[PDB]
Amino acid sequence: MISLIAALAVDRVIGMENAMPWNLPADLAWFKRNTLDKPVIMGRHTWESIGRPLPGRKNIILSSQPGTDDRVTWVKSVDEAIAACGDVPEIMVIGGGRVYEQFLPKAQKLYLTHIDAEVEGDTHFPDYEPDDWESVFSEFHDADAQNSHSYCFEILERR
Numbered sequence: 001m002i003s004l005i006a007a008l009a010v011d012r013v014i015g016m017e018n019a020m021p022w023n024l025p026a027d028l029a030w031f032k033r034n035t036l037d038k039p040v041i042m043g044r045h046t047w048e049s050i051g052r053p054l055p056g057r058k059n060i061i062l063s064s065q066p067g068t069d070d071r072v073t074w075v076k077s078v079d080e081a082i083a084a085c086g087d088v089p090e091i092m093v094i095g096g097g098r099v100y101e102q103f104l105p106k107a108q109k110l111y112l113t114h115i116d117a118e119v120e121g122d123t124h125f126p127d128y129e130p131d132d133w134e135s136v137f138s139e140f141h142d143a144d145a146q147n148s149h150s151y152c153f154e155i156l157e158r159r
């Protein structure tokens with residue numbers, strides 16, 4: 001199966017200027033926990049923000065254009081990307097915008113990080129529709145020394 005993994009602030013805002021308007025070390029942690037050992041599909045922009053491969057996971061990139069780091073596997077099509085994974089039980093789609101937009105429909109599970117912060121952003125998340133999804137997991141956390149905002153994890157299966 002396919003899965004999207006994202007962190008959303010208030011208004012489904014996912015980021016500003018090739019960045020994330022926040023800093024939650026704890027999300028990264030949860031993020032990694034959820035991805036370790038699985039293939040991650042990302043996009044040229046996302047990729048560019050990461051800047052280096054992600055250890056323990058198969059880094060697949062989407063670019064219309066030519067691969068520019070031999071360390072990571074590049075692709076020119078959703079189908080390619082999807083191909084590039086293989087016989088795995090779960091493929092993780094890690095962003096950004098456009099990519100989410102495109103795989104949402106194929107997804108069957110979501111790992112969300114609801115961040116309690118109202119911030120302006122230029123990229124929002126694909127509008128999912130409640131009806132379809134069944135929240136099967138939540139986990140709250142208050143802001144801290146390091147995670148300046150409170151946040152909540154959630155897991156939803158497509159009903």
Ligand SMILES: NC(=O)c1ccc[n+]([C@@H]2O[C@H](COP(=O)([O-])OP(=O)(O)OC[C@H]3O[C@@H](n4cnc5c(N)ncnc54)[C@H](OP(=O)(O)O)[C@@H]3O)[C@@H](O)[C@H]2O)c1
Pocket residue numbers: 005006007008013014015016017018019020042043044045046047049062063064065075076077078094095096097098099100123
């Ligand atoms: N908050 C989170 O949960 C989360 C997770 C990831 C990313 N993000 C944020 O998302 C924002 C950036 O996302 P974005 O949508 O602008 O970029 P993106 O999806 O990361 O990058 C888009 C690039 O994908 C390539 N592409 C996409 N679909 C393709 C396809 N089917 N075939 C070929 N190439 C394809 C194009 O590449 P070319 O250059 O090859 O034309 C396109 O410019 C950021 O601020 C980032 O930090 C947030």
Ligand SMILES: CN(Cc1cnc2nc(N)nc(N)c2n1)c1ccc(C(=O)N[C@@H](CCC(=O)O)C(=O)O)cc1
Pocket residue numbers: 005006007027028029031032046049050054055093094095112113
């Ligand atoms: C910019 N970006 C994309 C990013 C970030 N947080 C997200 N958070 C969630 N929940 N989902 C995403 N798709 C997501 N994507 C990043 C940036 C850094 C790392 C990264 O450093 N990951 C380390 C975590 C520890 C660290 O940064 O030192 C890992 O090993 O997975 C991952 C994604």
